[PDB]
Amino acid sequence: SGLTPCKESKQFAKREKQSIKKLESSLKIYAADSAPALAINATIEKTKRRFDNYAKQGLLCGADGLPHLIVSGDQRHWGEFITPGILFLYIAGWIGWVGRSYLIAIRDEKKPTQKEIIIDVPLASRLVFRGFSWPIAAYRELLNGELVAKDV
Amino acid sequence: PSLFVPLVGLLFPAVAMASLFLHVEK
Amino acid sequence: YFDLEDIGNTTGQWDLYGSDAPSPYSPLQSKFFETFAAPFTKRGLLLKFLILGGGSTLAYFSTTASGDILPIVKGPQLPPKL
Amino acid sequence: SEKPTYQVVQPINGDPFIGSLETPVTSSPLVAWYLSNLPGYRTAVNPLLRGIEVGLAHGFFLVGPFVKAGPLRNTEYAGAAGSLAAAGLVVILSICLTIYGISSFNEGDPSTAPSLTLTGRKKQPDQLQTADGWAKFTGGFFFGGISGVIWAFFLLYVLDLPY
Amino acid sequence: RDLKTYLSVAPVASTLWFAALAGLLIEINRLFPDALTFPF
Amino acid sequence: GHFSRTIAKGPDTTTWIWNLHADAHDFDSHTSDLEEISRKVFSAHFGQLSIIFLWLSGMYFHGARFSNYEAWLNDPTHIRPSAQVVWPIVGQEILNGDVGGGFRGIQITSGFFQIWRASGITSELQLYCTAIGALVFAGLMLFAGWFHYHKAAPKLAWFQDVESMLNHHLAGLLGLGSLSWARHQVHVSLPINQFLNAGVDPKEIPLPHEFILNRDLLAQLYPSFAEGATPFFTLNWSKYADFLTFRGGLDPLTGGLWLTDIAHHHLAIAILFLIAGHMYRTNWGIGHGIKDILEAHKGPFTGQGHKGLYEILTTSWHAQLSINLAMLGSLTIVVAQHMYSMPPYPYLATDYATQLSLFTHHMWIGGFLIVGAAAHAAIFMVRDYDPTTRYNDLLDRVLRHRDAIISHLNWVCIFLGFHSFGLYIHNDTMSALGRPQDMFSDTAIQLQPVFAQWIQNTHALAPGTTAPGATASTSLTWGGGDLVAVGNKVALLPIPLGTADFLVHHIHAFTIHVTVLILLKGVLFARSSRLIPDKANLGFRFPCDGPGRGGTCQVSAWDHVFLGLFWMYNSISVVIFHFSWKMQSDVWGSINDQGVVTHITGGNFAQSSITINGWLRDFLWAQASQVIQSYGSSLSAYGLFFLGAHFVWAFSLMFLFSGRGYWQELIESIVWAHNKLKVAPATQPRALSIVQGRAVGVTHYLLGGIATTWAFFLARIIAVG
Amino acid sequence: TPPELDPNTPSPIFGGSTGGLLRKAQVEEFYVITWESPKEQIFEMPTGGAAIMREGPNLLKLARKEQCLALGTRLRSKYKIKYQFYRVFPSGEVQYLHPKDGVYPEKVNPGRQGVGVNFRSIGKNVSPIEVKFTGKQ
Amino acid sequence: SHSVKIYDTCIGCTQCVRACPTDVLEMIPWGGCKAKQIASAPRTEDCVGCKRCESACPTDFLSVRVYLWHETTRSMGLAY
Numbered sequence A: 001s002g003l004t005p006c007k008e009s010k011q012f013a014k015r016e017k018q019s020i021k022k023l024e025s026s027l028k029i030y031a032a033d034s035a036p037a038l039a040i041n042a043t044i045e046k047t048k049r050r051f052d053n054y055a056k057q058g059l060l061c062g063a064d065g066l067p068h069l070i071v072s073g074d075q076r077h078w079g080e081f082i083t084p085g086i087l088f089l090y091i092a093g094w095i096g097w098v099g100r101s102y103l104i105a106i107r108d109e110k111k112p113t114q115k116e117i118i119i120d121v122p123l124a125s126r127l128v129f130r131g132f133s134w135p136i137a138a139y140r141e142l143l144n145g146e147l148v149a150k151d152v
Numbered sequence B: 001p002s003l004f005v006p007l008v009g010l011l012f013p014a015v016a017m018a019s020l021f022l023h024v025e026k
Numbered sequence C: 001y002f003d004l005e006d007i008g009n010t011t012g013q014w015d016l017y018g019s020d021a022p023s024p025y026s027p028l029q030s031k032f033f034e035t036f037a038a039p040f041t042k043r044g045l046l047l048k049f050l051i052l053g054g055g056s057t058l059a060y061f062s063t064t065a066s067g068d069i070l071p072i073v074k075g076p077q078l079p080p081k082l
Numbered sequence D: 001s002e003k004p005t006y007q008v009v010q011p012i013n014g015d016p017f018i019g020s021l022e023t024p025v026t027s028s029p030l031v032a033w034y035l036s037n038l039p040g041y042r043t044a045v046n047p048l049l050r051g052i053e054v055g056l057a058h059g060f061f062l063v064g065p066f067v068k069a070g071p072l073r074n075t076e077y078a079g080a081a082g083s084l085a086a087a088g089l090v091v092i093l094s095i096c097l098t099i100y101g102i103s104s105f106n107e108g109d110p111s112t113a114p115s116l117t118l119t120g121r122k123k124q125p126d127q128l129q130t131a132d133g134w135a136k137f138t139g140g141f142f143f144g145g146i147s148g149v150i151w152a153f154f155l156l157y158v159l160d161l162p163y
Numbered sequence E: 001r002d003l004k005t006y007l008s009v010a011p012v013a014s015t016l017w018f019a020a021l022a023g024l025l026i027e028i029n030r031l032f033p034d035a036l037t038f039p040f
Numbered sequence F: 001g002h003f004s005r006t007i008a009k010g011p012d013t014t015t016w017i018w019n020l021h022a023d024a025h026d027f028d029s030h031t032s033d034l035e036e037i038s039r040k041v042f043s044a045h046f047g048q049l050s051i052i053f054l055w056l057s058g059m060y061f062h063g064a065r066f067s068n069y070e071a072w073l074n075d076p077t078h079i080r081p082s083a084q085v086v087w088p089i090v091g092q093e094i095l096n097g098d099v100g101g102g103f104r105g106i107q108i109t110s111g112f113f114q115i116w117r118a119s120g121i122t123s124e125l126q127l128y129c130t131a132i133g134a135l136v137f138a139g140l141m142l143f144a145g146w147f148h149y150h151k152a153a154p155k156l157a158w159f160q161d162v163e164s165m166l167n168h169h170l171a172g173l174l175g176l177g178s179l180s181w182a183r184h185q186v187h188v189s190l191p192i193n194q195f196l197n198a199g200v201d202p203k204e205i206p207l208p209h210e211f212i213l214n215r216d217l218l219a220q221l222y223p224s225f226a227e228g229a230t231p232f233f234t235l236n237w238s239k240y241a242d243f244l245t246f247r248g249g250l251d252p253l254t255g256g257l258w259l260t261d262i263a264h265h266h267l268a269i270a271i272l273f274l275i276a277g278h279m280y281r282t283n284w285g286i287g288h289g290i291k292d293i294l295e296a297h298k299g300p301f302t303g304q305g306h307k308g309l310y311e312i313l314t315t316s317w318h319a320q321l322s323i324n325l326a327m328l329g330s331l332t333i334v335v336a337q338h339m340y341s342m343p344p345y346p347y348l349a350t351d352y353a354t355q356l357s358l359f360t361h362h363m364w365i366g367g368f369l370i371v372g373a374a375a376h377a378a379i380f381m382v383r384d385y386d387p388t389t390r391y392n393d394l395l396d397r398v399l400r401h402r403d404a405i406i407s408h409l410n411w412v413c414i415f416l417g418f419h420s421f422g423l424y425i426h427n428d429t430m431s432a433l434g435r436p437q438d439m440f441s442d443t444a445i446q447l448q449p450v451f452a453q454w455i456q457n458t459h460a461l462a463p464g465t466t467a468p469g470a471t472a473s474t475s476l477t478w479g480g481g482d483l484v485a486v487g488n489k490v491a492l493l494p495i496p497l498g499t500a501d502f503l504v505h506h507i508h509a510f511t512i513h514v515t516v517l518i519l520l521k522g523v524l525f526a527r528s529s530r531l532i533p534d535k536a537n538l539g540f541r542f543p544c545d546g547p548g549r550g551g552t553c554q555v556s557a558w559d560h561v562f563l564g565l566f567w568m569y570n571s572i573s574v575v576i577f578h579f580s581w582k583m584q585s586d587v588w589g590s591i592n593d594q595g596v597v598t599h600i601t602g603g604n605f606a607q608s609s610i611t612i613n614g615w616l617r618d619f620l621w622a623q624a625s626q627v628i629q630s631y632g633s634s635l636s637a638y639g640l641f642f643l644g645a646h647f648v649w650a651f652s653l654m655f656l657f658s659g660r661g662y663w664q665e666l667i668e669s670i671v672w673a674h675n676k677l678k679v680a681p682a683t684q685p686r687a688l689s690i691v692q693g694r695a696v697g698v699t700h701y702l703l704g705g706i707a708t709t710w711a712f713f714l715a716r717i718i719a720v721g
Numbered sequence G: 001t002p003p004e005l006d007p008n009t010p011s012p013i014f015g016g017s018t019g020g021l022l023r024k025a026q027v028e029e030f031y032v033i034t035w036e037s038p039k040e041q042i043f044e045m046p047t048g049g050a051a052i053m054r055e056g057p058n059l060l061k062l063a064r065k066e067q068c069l070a071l072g073t074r075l076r077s078k079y080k081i082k083y084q085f086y087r088v089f090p091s092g093e094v095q096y097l098h099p100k101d102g103v104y105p106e107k108v109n110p111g112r113q114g115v116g117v118n119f120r121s122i123g124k125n126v127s128p129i130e131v132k133f134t135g136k137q
Numbered sequence H: 001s002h003s004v005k006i007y008d009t010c011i012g013c014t015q016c017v018r019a020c021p022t023d024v025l026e027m028i029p030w031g032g033c034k035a036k037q038i039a040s041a042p043r044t045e046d047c048v049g050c051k052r053c054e055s056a057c058p059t060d061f062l063s064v065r066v067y068l069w070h071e072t073t074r075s076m077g078l079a080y
Ligand code: CLA
Pocket: F002, F039, F040, F041, F043, F044, F046, F047, F048, F142, F143, F144, F145, F146, F149
């Protein structure tokens, strides 16, 4: 953390100006009122906006003038990894739990492989939303989240 | 001096390859 | 059609292709060659003579004026940091 | 087997179960006559005499390439002395010949060569093979090679045609 | 008409699913582009 | 497997899924009924034609709505040809770059812009119609296949009448096709382009149909059109010579072949294909029995010959497919080497970016198709070769002395390999040791290609002497002292041939001979071998026959195509490299006011392409700087694809250097982890088959390798040209 | 069973090839195969192509043994033909192999001798052990 | 040459024999299974070691096992 925040940065600020000047260089040959015109100018506002937002949310920015994320767990920078990370695992589990729940329901009777290549069973009866509460799989763990066939 | 030895370092492969050839076909 | 356990040779490509020629000979000049090529006909003795004939290679390199073994002269480069 | 065959590719010596076939290149009187002659062939002749012919011819041939394409093409100093190089090759080439001759012993069950001509005459042996025979031949080659080398240099070390 | 449904229920399902997923993701990026963090 | 019932049966392993696609088009493995197969493939061709037709519709459509073709028309010299536009999402809009004409788009290299100008197309209105007409055709073609498989499928007897099919295809399609196009040229292409070369502007050009109706507009230029009766019926034909000529060479203002020549060309080609169309026997007497004529040729060397061929090439698709693939591929290659030397389109040669990519594209397509000929030729030997019913005798003997052909071809490759690559290793060693006199160079011991230099010499002195009607040369690479310069760019110039040109041709001799070796060895030894006397019973596509006999890996004819596939890559990959450097170094460049010509790399080909280090530095390292510095610019995608290809390529080595036994054992440990958590699929996961792993390997190798140059070349010529 | 023996028989029509015997036959071994055809048919012939079968005893000389069986197994299929092949050697000698018992190996016969039969069952093999043998005895 | 063994876990389906192109195996009267036959490996000298026999075996793991040992011309599959 030798980095000083993107607000009091001279490099990250300089980098903003450099990028928009190059974009401005391009619209000079098309004449305003034209299509390639807005597209360039629309790109410029997005450029200004993203530079503006990064300074707001914190983001430390190294000497190179680009934001560096801090994943130490620091409460000041939770939004840089932990909060998106919690969101990922949620969806990651949800997918995992829904998929597992499917192959389980299929196994008894029928031709199980038939359901795997073709699933004219959609979410089975109603399996998707079951993922809304996947984390309750912790309670599935205390019972039989795992099979006892091989080892423990 | 050093212009006598790298060739015997090349006479030696000739000698070694010949001897070994006789050894392996025997 | 023609397989004969009696002769196993013609059965196989045992026969010398007509390129064999077991004909006469060549002029009497041979009487000369047989006299002077004899020491090299012994084998093993010749193997040695040729290897020790490698003493020629040593002699030829110990004494050799025109092979690049001299700079010829220059002032050498320092050169990246001396 | 002549001559209304109206076709070329007679099975090798009448045997269609031995791999090879009869073609003009394989068997044409001109080719056959040519092949029958030469030192490698010409069985029943002294091996030393044959090596000399072969050796002498090759040694002479080797000089040209070495002298012309040598590191000193291109030099009085290396005007043709490179022929010495051609000579060295025949020194080495005589080793390879000598060591190969040790694959034939002196017992020697002389000759691994076929014991019959085509036409299955069933008569005669070859003798190039065998320890004594092969060795004579090398010695001839060595002799023939060194000489062919010197002679070719000779003419070149005088020449006049073609400068 | 049972047949068309099944037909749409093979690996094509994957394309439709990933097309729908892509559309969602792109549109999310339209409304919230250049997102390096979750700040709420 | 949808195609077969047992195949469809049920899935127990994942191998079923891979097999399903692998034998999807393998029509002769689904039935033994020849008629059923033929009916299948015939409909399949319709479905193909629909796709390429749809493909064309999108090219015309995009040219209309998403291109600056009109803008390029007025100022072709320094406007960059661009079709297709990128939506401004997740930062994409940077790929939209300055291409001139006040337009933002990706610069293209297909060459449609040059095609459209030649056709006399002037407005998006015209492109819009052609797009719809193509879609209408695409609807037909797709419908036509459905109609000829479910409603009215032809008999086997229909397909077997090859004589009738021949007569039509090289007359009804070729002849009238050439003739029909010949008409559009002199009525639309030639008049309109004549205006375009006069700087009249497209909107100031009258509409094409006004040229056809009243002769007045078309007659003021090319006054032979003035006579209503026309001198054609007078059969003098000398009067017509104004709109068509045998001038040849190149127009100094448009840089393409004179349309004045191409019209005459098609006029000749048309009837030449119309006459040659009247050859084979049908129903009304006059004609040939190809069966009869084929039988007639026999020989002291061939004994019976060609007898029985007609039976083979009328009952075996793979036999016909091999022949067609062998020459259609060969045709694509000569197309590449005829369009570069004789630029047939207006402002084509000037557009260096298009020319490099056109030549390179045709070389790969031609290269691939030829390799495919090897496959189906081998498939024929395994599946359709039956001496009992269809003996040829030509095929025999070939099989009879097959150990001979391969052994000789084996030797030639070694001779060529030494006498090609070795020379370079010589030069690389003599230069490193500080003795350039020793090297094979124009400055030292030179190996001049006097034969090629002599053929070019006679082509230069051809007009007037052995070609009176020819005013100028065929191509300006055979010119002598001529120089065409469209814009500030050089369209074409006499191409020199030196010792550096002697080496590279001998490398192409090599690479082609080895590629032939691998493929031809797989075809002849497809059925039997001393090693495997019954290989034909193992099929065409099998991995092996065990570790026995020391090891019998890749003995299949399939694997010979697999090995020869890399070599076809190695081959072309160096042809296109020869093309790129030679054109940049000794042809392409800018011409000044005085007449001094500066080439892109400045004639460094002659003394630096004789070294391996020279290609690695002066060519690769040098000309890469564009692709590796394309970040933050319009050519951003090429930089990424350059890196992206390098990956799919190194990704192939994973499949090629290993075997499935390792992977299956690894999966075992992974299946265990699944069974612990109730997440084991009923469809048991299996590793790829031994043969599939090779198929997967070579595809990614070719993709990553080919793709990687694609980005190489397209980044280079665009930034420089 | 008494081996029948082969003396002289005519060879099938063919005209030659480059896949025939070569030197190995002269110095090590070569294999011959005999079969009787009820018709002058046409068979593929390994290591080449197209040869007329002939009608009669039919005698053919090949190499590797395997080449003979391949032909023989094709000879038993397609055409309902019985066949037998031997290993000639270079100095006469009469080694007759296959069928041998006189009844095909695939068909169980009364007095053959097991040779290399393990009544342990696989997976019950040991681990070395620096002593001679590998454990799959 | 190569070393081949047969195991009592065999069921006498005779597919290993039909697969062999050199005739290394054969069937044998036995009392161990319903077929009352069992594979035999008398002629290991002609064995090339291609494991065609193993790819025809239906027993859970092979009743016939080929152990590639010393190499000979016959095992090397040479015709020259
Ligand atoms: C009009 C609608 C229609 C319908 C309902 C059918 C229905 C059927 N067809 Mg027919 N067919 C049609 C149109 C249709 N077809 C057309 C327009 C053609 C001309 C090309 C054909 C040519 C054809 C042949 C040769 C055969 C059939 C067969 C069949 C039967 C089996 C289906 C099958 O082949 O497996 C699979 C179903 C598919 C849809 C496979 C996909 C193939 C399409 C064309 C892919 C499209 C190309 C794609 C864009 C390539 C780019 C991919 C890219 C994204 C990477 C089934 C009754 C088969 C049969 O009779 O069984 C023995 C058969 O032999 N069809």
